[PDB]
Design an enzyme around this catalytic site. Structure first.
Site, PDB file in Angstrom:
ATOM      1  N   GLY A 141     -21.358 -42.547  69.850  1.00 53.84           N
ATOM      2  CA  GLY A 141     -22.748 -42.635  70.257  1.00 53.84           C
ATOM      3  C   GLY A 141     -22.906 -42.966  71.729  1.00 53.84           C
ATOM      4  O   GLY A 141     -22.115 -42.549  72.590  1.00 53.84           O
ATOM      5  N   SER A 142     -23.937 -43.765  72.017  1.00 54.15           N
ATOM      6  CA  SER A 142     -24.350 -44.037  73.390  1.00 54.15           C
ATOM      7  C   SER A 142     -23.228 -44.591  74.257  1.00 54.15           C
ATOM      8  O   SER A 142     -23.303 -44.473  75.486  1.00 54.15           O
ATOM      9  CB  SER A 142     -25.528 -45.010  73.387  1.00 54.15           C
ATOM     10  OG  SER A 142     -26.661 -44.435  72.765  1.00 54.15           O
ATOM     11  N   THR A 143     -22.186 -45.178  73.657  1.00 55.73           N
ATOM     12  CA  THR A 143     -21.082 -45.710  74.452  1.00 55.73           C
ATOM     13  C   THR A 143     -20.416 -44.653  75.323  1.00 55.73           C
ATOM     14  O   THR A 143     -19.640 -45.018  76.212  1.00 55.73           O
ATOM     15  CB  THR A 143     -20.019 -46.356  73.554  1.00 55.73           C
ATOM     16  OG1 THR A 143     -19.501 -45.382  72.640  1.00 55.73           O
ATOM     17  CG2 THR A 143     -20.604 -47.534  72.777  1.00 55.73           C
ATOM     18  N   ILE A 144     -20.697 -43.364  75.101  1.00 58.34           N
ATOM     19  CA  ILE A 144     -20.086 -42.341  75.947  1.00 58.34           C
ATOM     20  C   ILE A 144     -20.702 -42.328  77.342  1.00 58.34           C
ATOM     21  O   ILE A 144     -20.041 -41.932  78.312  1.00 58.34           O
ATOM     22  CB  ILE A 144     -20.190 -40.955  75.285  1.00 58.34           C
ATOM     23  CG1 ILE A 144     -19.349 -39.938  76.057  1.00 58.34           C
ATOM     24  CG2 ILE A 144     -21.633 -40.496  75.244  1.00 58.34           C
ATOM     25  CD1 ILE A 144     -17.873 -40.267  76.091  1.00 58.34           C
TER      26      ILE A 144
END
Length: 630
Positions: free
Chosen positions: A378-381
């Site tokens: 998810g957003s951690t990319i």
């Protein structure tokens, strides 16, 4: 002669059924083909007979009886063995056709054998090497544990009642105890081991040995001093099965050996085990046919700090997920935690039935480590992508982007689909405020402006699509199911809603360029006396790009608008990023963070089933606790 050459070929090729057919009429009686074949197979299998060479000599007297000398050499689990002997060949008529037949006898197996002598193959288990953390604290060690047993002569006329009471006390059966008491070696003054017990159960040993003829010793045993707190990291050993034993190189294991099944026990099985000893001998005479001494295994020293390990365990122990703690400067691994877990001591001392059934019906799979599996990040990319966009010139961190509304499509060709951002406060959005507000459209446009080729190459510089250089096997991270084959999938992968999957270990590793230098650090579990932080890919982001990314990751934690603002924790200097990957379904929460001031700690944490618990917030609260608040 033809019969002798054929017999020798059959025996070099170890085809004993073909061998039985050439035997004399007398030997056909008193020895059935079943027993011939079984005896050869059992002896050669258990002794580990390989490299067999049988060679025949020359006849001497010229007739219906001949003598042909021969020699046999072979390798056994106890060493090389060779002998010379003479086969008697008698010509014999069965039914209506004569033939030369070998007058076999047990001396063709080993020379010492005869019709009143057998062979025995015993093994000597070496001392298994031990596993320590960075400060010498034992994580998988060898210790002396109680062993309850019976001396038969001490039983008197109370054998039955004693076996009944001891069976009730030790959760064994009466039949099992009697079977152990009926073994061939058992003499009236010998100690017959019945059960090994954990060290913390002296009260049980006291109760049990207070019975007639029941006594106690201490036996060396594997032991995992912190149990389920390090269970996935240590893994475990346990008794090898007969079928497992059939697959290994003969000599390396016996029917009573331990073998590492999971964790570092398995990964370093060869280093930890050592060399197995063997003795092939004749029990009626005591003569030794061959002998080989055991050799102890080698110890293993880890980068793990058990204090960090236990803090992370205490946070995750009741949930389902993983946590990795690295020292991002040196690349050492301070902690690898997975929940739910299990006590590997169960595989050494035996499981209680309720605990074994609990662990096997648990749908969160306690025996499987989650820190080496790949999940949707998810957003951690987003920072990683940003790094690439700064590395390949297509993104400037200080330049704002024009974004109006909460939806955006590239053109009419998307149609009913558009990238959605949660807020619409900011119309001019730079990198810092893009990270703080977790602006999906900003990063979709980052991916699109970047292009598929450069973004794939950049993700590869952060360690996607390649083997993970790490001593604990890590499943590879994936960019997409196939490739970034469309503008829509490209955009979605930009802000983390595509086909990508990372491991917790890899995500921890892939935020290490943000800390200081820009290098992707090579993670390691193995303690090295060398103070050399190995790099896995050099300068995957610039120093100034890492500072630009750290500004926004700081804001994610310290700016009130950030996803990791709550709870406010005084003292910590942590920059990081949150994520939520959905799966009426569930969703997984992520937090990846590092100490942007002390630069000596990085943690990645992932907890499952957080949709009704505040999502990534539930993870964030547990993650901030791990950091130096000084």
């Amino acid at each position: 002669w033809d019969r002798m050459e054929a017999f020798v070929k059959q025996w070099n090729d170890q085809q004993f059924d073909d061998m039985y057919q050439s035997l004399t009429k007398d030997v056909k009686k008193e020895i059935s083909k079943k027993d011939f074949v079984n005896r050869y197979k059992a002896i050669y299998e258990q002794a580990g007979v390989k490299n067999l060479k049988v060679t025949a000599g020359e006849v001497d007297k010229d007739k219906t009886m001949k003598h042909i000398p021969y020699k046999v050499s072979m390798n056994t689990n106890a060493g090389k063995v060779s002998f010379k002997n003479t086969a008697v060949l008698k010509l014999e008529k069965t039914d209506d056709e004569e033939s030369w037949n070998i007058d076999w006898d047990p001396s063709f197996i080993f020379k010492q054998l005869a019709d009143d002598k057998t062979v025995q193959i015993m093994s000597i288990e070496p001392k298994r090497g031990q596993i320590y953390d960075k400060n010498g604290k034992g994580l998988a060690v060898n210790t002396d544990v109680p062993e309850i047993g019976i001396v038969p002569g001490e039983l008197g006329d109370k054998k039955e009642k004693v076996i009944k009471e001891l069976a009730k006390k030790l959760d064994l059966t009466e039949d099992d105890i009697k079977k152990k008491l009926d073994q061939g070696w058992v003499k009236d003054d010998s100690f017959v081991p019945l059960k090994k017990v954990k060290p913390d159960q002296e009260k049980l040993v006291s109760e049990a040995t207070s019975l007639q003829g029941v006594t106690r010793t201490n036996v060396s045993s594997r032991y995992y001093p912190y149990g389920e707190k390090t269970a996935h990291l240590t893994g475990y050993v346990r008794a090898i099965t007969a079928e497992e034993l059939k697959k290994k190189k003969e000599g390396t294991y016996s029917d009573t050996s331990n073998i590492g099944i999971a964790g570092l026990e398995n990964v370093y099985e060869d280093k930890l085990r050592g060399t197995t000893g063997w003795k092939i001998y004749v029990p009626q005479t005591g003569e030794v046919i061959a002998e080989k001494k055991a050799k102890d295994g080698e110890d293993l020293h880890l980068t793990i700090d058990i204090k960090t390990q236990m803090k992370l365990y205490d946070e995750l122990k009741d949930d389902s997920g993983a946590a990795v703690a690295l020292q991002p400067k040196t690349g050492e691994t301070l902690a690898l935690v997975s929940a739910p877990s299990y006590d590997p001591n169960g595989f050494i001392f035996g499981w209680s039935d309720k605990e074994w059934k609990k662990l096997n019906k648990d749908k969160n799979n306690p025996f499987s480590a989650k820190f080496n599996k790949t999940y949707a990040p998810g957003s951690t990319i987003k920072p990683i992508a940003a790094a690439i966009g700064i590395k390949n010139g297509t993104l400037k961190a200080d330049e704002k982007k024009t974004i109006k509304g909460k939806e955006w499509q590239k053109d009419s060709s998307w149609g009913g689909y558009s990238v959605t951002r949660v807020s619409e406060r900011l119309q001019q959005v730079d990198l810092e405020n893009a990270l703080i507000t977790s602006d999906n459209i900003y990063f979709a446009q980052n991916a699109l402006d970047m292009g598929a080729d450069t973004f794939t190459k950049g993700l590869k510089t952060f360690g996607f699509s390649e083997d993970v250089p790490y001593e604990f096997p890590i499943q590879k991270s994936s960019i997409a199911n196939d490739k970034l084959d469309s503008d829509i999938l490209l955009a979605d992968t930009g802000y983390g809603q595509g086909q990508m999957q990372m491991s917790p270990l890899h995500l921890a590793t892939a935020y290490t360029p943000f800390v200081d230098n820009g290098d992707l650090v090579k993670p390691t579990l193995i303690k090295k006396d060398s103070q050399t932080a190995d790099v896995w890919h050099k300068q995957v982001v610039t120093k100034e790009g890492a500072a630009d990314i750290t500004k926004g990751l700081k804001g994610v934690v310290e700016d009130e608008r950030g996803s990791a603002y709550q709870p406010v924790v005084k003292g910590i200097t942590v920059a990081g990023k949150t994520g939520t990957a959905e799966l009426d379904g569930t969703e997984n929460g992520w937090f990846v963070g590092y100490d942007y001031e002390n630069k000596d700690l990085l943690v990645a944490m992932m907890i499952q089933n957080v949709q009704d618990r505040g999502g990534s917030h539930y993870v964030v609260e547990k993650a901030k606790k791990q950091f130096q608040s000084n």
